[PDB]
Write an enzyme that holds these catalytic residues in place. Sequence first.
Site, PDB file in Angstrom:
ATOM      1  N   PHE A   1       2.753  -0.966 -21.159  1.00 27.68           N
ATOM      2  CA  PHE A   1       4.637  -1.959 -21.041  1.00 27.68           C
ATOM      3  C   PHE A   1       4.945  -1.913 -22.109  1.00 27.68           C
ATOM      4  CE2 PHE A   1       2.347  -4.254 -17.550  1.00 27.68           C
ATOM      5  CZ  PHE A   1       3.688  -4.012 -15.873  1.00 27.68           C
TER       6      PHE A   1
ATOM      7  N   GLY B   1      -5.822 -12.542 -16.739  1.00 20.19           N
ATOM      8  CA  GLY B   1      -5.278 -13.122 -15.884  1.00 20.19           C
ATOM      9  C   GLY B   1      -6.177 -12.388 -14.209  1.00 20.19           C
ATOM     10  N   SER B   2      -6.082 -12.830 -13.220  1.00 17.21           N
ATOM     11  CA  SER B   2      -6.851 -12.282 -12.096  1.00 17.21           C
ATOM     12  C   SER B   2      -6.889 -10.676 -12.118  1.00 17.21           C
ATOM     13  CB  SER B   2      -5.976 -13.168 -10.833  1.00 17.21           C
ATOM     14  OG  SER B   2      -6.812 -14.893 -10.974  1.00 17.21           O
ATOM     15  N   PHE B   3      -5.870 -10.249 -12.258  1.00 15.91           N
ATOM     16  CA  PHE B   3      -5.339  -9.341 -11.891  1.00 15.91           C
ATOM     17  C   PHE B   3      -6.115  -8.107 -12.702  1.00 15.91           C
ATOM     18  CE2 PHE B   3      -3.024 -10.781 -15.277  1.00 15.91           C
ATOM     19  CZ  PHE B   3      -3.236  -9.975 -16.528  1.00 15.91           C
ATOM     20  N   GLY B   4      -6.864  -8.638 -14.243  1.00 14.05           N
ATOM     21  CA  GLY B   4      -8.217  -8.394 -15.476  1.00 14.05           C
ATOM     22  C   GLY B   4      -7.161  -8.577 -16.444  1.00 14.05           C
ATOM     23  N   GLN B   5      -7.070  -7.804 -17.286  1.00 14.37           N
ATOM     24  CA  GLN B   5      -6.542  -8.470 -18.512  1.00 14.37           C
ATOM     25  C   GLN B   5      -6.065  -7.445 -19.441  1.00 14.37           C
ATOM     26  OE1 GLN B   5     -11.017  -8.022 -20.222  1.00 14.37           O
ATOM     27  NE2 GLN B   5     -10.113  -6.126 -19.209  1.00 14.37           N
ATOM     28  N   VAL B   6      -4.306  -7.508 -20.398  1.00 16.67           N
ATOM     29  CA  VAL B   6      -3.726  -7.338 -21.813  1.00 16.67           C
ATOM     30  C   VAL B   6      -4.513  -6.758 -22.908  1.00 16.67           C
ATOM     31  CG1 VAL B   6      -1.435  -7.138 -22.121  1.00 16.67           C
ATOM     32  CG2 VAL B   6      -2.328  -8.641 -19.945  1.00 16.67           C
TER      33      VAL B   6
ATOM     34  N   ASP C   1       5.694 -16.830  -9.472  1.00 17.64           N
ATOM     35  CA  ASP C   1       4.579 -17.180 -10.241  1.00 17.64           C
ATOM     36  C   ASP C   1       5.014 -17.177 -11.192  1.00 17.64           C
ATOM     37  OD1 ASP C   1       2.176 -18.730 -10.413  1.00 17.64           O
ATOM     38  OD2 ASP C   1       1.522 -16.629 -10.800  1.00 17.64           O
TER      39      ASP C   1
HETATM   40  C1  LIG Z   1       0.052 -11.348 -22.449  1.00 12.09           C
HETATM   41  O1  LIG Z   1       0.772 -10.199 -21.787  1.00 12.09           O
HETATM   42  C2  LIG Z   1       1.907  -9.877 -22.697  1.00 12.09           C
HETATM   43  C3  LIG Z   1       2.071  -9.447 -23.610  1.00 12.09           C
HETATM   44  C4  LIG Z   1       2.411  -8.954 -24.846  1.00 12.09           C
HETATM   45  N1  LIG Z   1       3.395  -8.373 -24.423  1.00 12.09           N
HETATM   46  C5  LIG Z   1       3.628  -7.772 -22.919  1.00 12.09           C
HETATM   47  N2  LIG Z   1       3.961  -6.087 -22.259  1.00 12.09           N
HETATM   48  C6  LIG Z   1       4.210  -6.951 -20.893  1.00 12.09           C
HETATM   49  C7  LIG Z   1       3.196  -8.094 -20.647  1.00 12.09           C
HETATM   50  C8  LIG Z   1       2.651  -8.301 -19.213  1.00 12.09           C
HETATM   51  C9  LIG Z   1       1.430  -8.979 -19.115  1.00 12.09           C
HETATM   52  C10 LIG Z   1       1.138  -9.373 -18.120  1.00 12.09           C
HETATM   53  N3  LIG Z   1       2.358  -8.715 -16.859  1.00 12.09           N
HETATM   54  C11 LIG Z   1       2.317  -7.907 -16.856  1.00 12.09           C
HETATM   55  N4  LIG Z   1       3.938  -7.460 -16.179  1.00 12.09           N
HETATM   56  N5  LIG Z   1       3.301  -7.593 -18.235  1.00 12.09           N
HETATM   57  C12 LIG Z   1       2.462  -8.628 -21.906  1.00 12.09           C
END
Ligand SMILES: COc1ccnc2[nH]cc(-c3ccnc(N)n3)c12
Length: 340
Positions: free
Chosen positions: A103, A33-38, A152
Amino acid sequence: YNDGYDDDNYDYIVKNGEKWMDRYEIDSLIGKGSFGQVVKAYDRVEQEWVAIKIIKNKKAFLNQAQIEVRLLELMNKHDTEMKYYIVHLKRHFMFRNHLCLVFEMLSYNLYDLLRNTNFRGVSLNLTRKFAQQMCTALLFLATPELSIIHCDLKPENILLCNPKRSAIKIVDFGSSCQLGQRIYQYIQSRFYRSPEVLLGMPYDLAIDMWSLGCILVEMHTGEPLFSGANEVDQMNKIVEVLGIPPAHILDQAPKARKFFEKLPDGTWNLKKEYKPPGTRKLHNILGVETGGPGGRRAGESGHTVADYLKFKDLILRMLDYDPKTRIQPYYALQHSFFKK
Ligand SMILES: COc1ccnc2[nH]cc(-c3ccnc(N)n3)c12
């Protein structure tokens, strides 16, 4: 850039296999996303899978994520079952000049789920289960202490807990704010953007309920309700279904004249392709009297004309042009659509 750990987008260059603080094993990139990555990572200390949101190594994104941390911690403080409709932040840390929010691991988003329907949509019964959860979520965010506008809401920001159940959660509070501003910004994704944000007007929590009405019709039909190529196309597509917004709105709206003309008698109409206003009835989009969307629900349990009528009624009250009278979450939850 950052001892070779960052690319020229300020993102952390993720390596599968990498071990962090002798605690986290980075499995893979699950989000961008704009924030960076997951990333998906294994927490050897808590014997559990987690999602780590790695924020860009740039002051503004770090400050944005510090606001997300603050709002998430505020919500976790609350002693209610309703706070389980929001993704849980376990903790956060600075690591190689990146803020990392840890998270709970969730599953697929509602857009992935539409793709597994081949964009033909999910049953009215599963729509109702998602709608119920999303209204409880909005009820929780409208708690006066919180007063959080997500800003959003879209299928991509609503994730399933797991692939076996209908439980969902909202993620990504990076675009969020608390009520107490009464200012305009270019906000929400275009397909889910409320008429007041299009019109350059101040916004409150009602914009998330606009987004929810759009999301719920899409979840059932498979397609975005209002898939505008731009803001003019977006308003034009809204006016096809809902007609001309009330003059008392348009008279206050700084961007009213971008989309509408005021006529000599003080009535408003579209500016100088598209169906006439109010020609694309939601009645027809949902297939109320004709077996649902593309008639694919013809004699299916829980898809009666009276089921579609209750649904149509809820959505038209969520898609009220007036933010003052747009249905609030509590009353949405009392709607006969959820008396099953
Ligand atoms: C791709 O995002 C996820 C995929 C799987 N589990 C997830 N648990 C939390 C997230 C997530 C992602 C972006 N922002 C926030 N606040 N949380 C997430």
